[PDB]
Amino acid sequence: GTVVGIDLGTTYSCVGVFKNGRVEIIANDQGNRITPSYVAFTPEGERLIGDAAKNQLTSNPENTVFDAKRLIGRTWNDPSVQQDIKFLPFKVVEKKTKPYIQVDIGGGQTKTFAPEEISAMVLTKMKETAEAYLGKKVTHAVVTVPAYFNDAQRQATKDAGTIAGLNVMRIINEPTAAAIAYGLDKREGEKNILVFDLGGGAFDVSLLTIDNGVFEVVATNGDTHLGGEDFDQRVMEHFIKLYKKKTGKDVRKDNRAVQKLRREVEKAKRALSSQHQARIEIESFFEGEDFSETLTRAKFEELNMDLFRSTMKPVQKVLEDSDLKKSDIDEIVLVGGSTRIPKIQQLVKEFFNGKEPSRGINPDEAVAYGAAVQAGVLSGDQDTGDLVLLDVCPLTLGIETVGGVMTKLIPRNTVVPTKKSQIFSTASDNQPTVTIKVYEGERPLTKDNHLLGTFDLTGIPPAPRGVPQIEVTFEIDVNGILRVTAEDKGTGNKNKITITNDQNRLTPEEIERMVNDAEK
């Protein structure tokens, strides 16, 4: 059938389709070309998704869920998760060492949701938007992720798709999708393109070559917990302390108060893109009293300057890894909602010595546009030809060797799909199991990198130490996801080598439990 492209964003999501030669961003049932990544459950038992969920946040905050993308594929003890909890109105609890979301679903029934199930509900809304527009069932999709998403975060996003009833044919990196929207129908030789993607939750920078429909990522770097949400948090913080200094009251108590301030901070940020002052006004803020303050552009910039300035470091890194200088960059493409902030535009322009970014790119829609194009390439119904994409892995994959040392296996910025083999043996006589720990990151010791998984090679036949010869193959697929397999290569009595792991990701059984649910 028809394959759609869905930009699943931290705060807003967007769906498009590429067919009959052209790209069409699809408007939702309220006429909006983007949909808030919000889900809500009313006291009466009704589930809301999108605009309807966001517009009742301030009256039903405990049972309104959002920012699931900053929770997805992480652990409960993650310092990033514990930071966000302070500003979210819904209960986040530990389960299987992951953060799960607890709400009342209506008729006083408590339920606990994985972050994947929340994102699945958002995907279900985007799928129904496309189904209405096209007048047929949509079972196939391309879905986006930040370029710097790790292995667990990627897989978790695919699982969300599966829970939504979608066959996710491809996971495309957000900056690559944005580059497609820019470069589609450029016919002017090889160009070096830098994409600067600062959204509602994640930050990516990617350097690409684009040449008459052939797209190739050279280098990428970013931060998966840096975006609009962090800028909003710094401003919310400033006003919670300000209110406490004026009245002696801690609004951290009342969830309505905190989320009323969120709603107003969002509007004030938007206004500060085209004016230098904005009024924060809340009727019935805390215990009936109202809130009335002004935020200047200078104060907003003051509160976030460290975060804004930190976006320049990943830019320096991709130039160093690509072996290119500033003057080699032919075009700068800004995408993501936070690139509308004037200070972000100034920093980028000053870093590239006065160079203007490209016009004709809507930063909220450009990623969905390219996602739609990649979707069409994978269907005979929609494929025009003249579209070749080569992407890379964002993180160095290595194995833990003796002393907690990171031994590199596949370096960062290697084109995918790719694979690498290594032979392992045993350390003692008749050892039945060999354990391998895979890590993601650039630091020399595994303690300072991120653990992808602990893999056990079981069923190793009895032999003296050092005799067995097990070839383990590590394959990163086109989606950027790792698969590990093992073969016995010995000169003797062999066996099937079975691999188990310690990874916390969802099994098809659990997905089937969730897919055979959510009709409630």
Author numbering: 28 to 547
What does the primary publication say about this deposited structure?
In all structures BiP adopted a very similar domain-docked conformation in absence of density for ATP in the NBD and all reveal additional density protruding from the T518 side chain. Furthermore, their L7,8 loop regions appeared more disordered than surrounding parts of the SBDβ (indicated by higher B-factors). These findings indicate that the bulky modification favored solvent exposure of loop L7,8 and prevented T518 from forming intramolecular contacts observed in structures of unmodified BiP or other Hsp70s. The substrate-binding domain of AMPylated apo BiP is found in a conformation typical of ATP-bound Hsp70/BiP and its widened substrate binding groove likely underlies the destabilizing effect of AMPylation on substrate binding. In the structures presented here the modified T518 side chain was flipped outward and pointed into the solvent. This suggests that the bulky and hydrophilic AMP moiety sterically prevents loop L7,8 from reverting to its ADP-bound position.
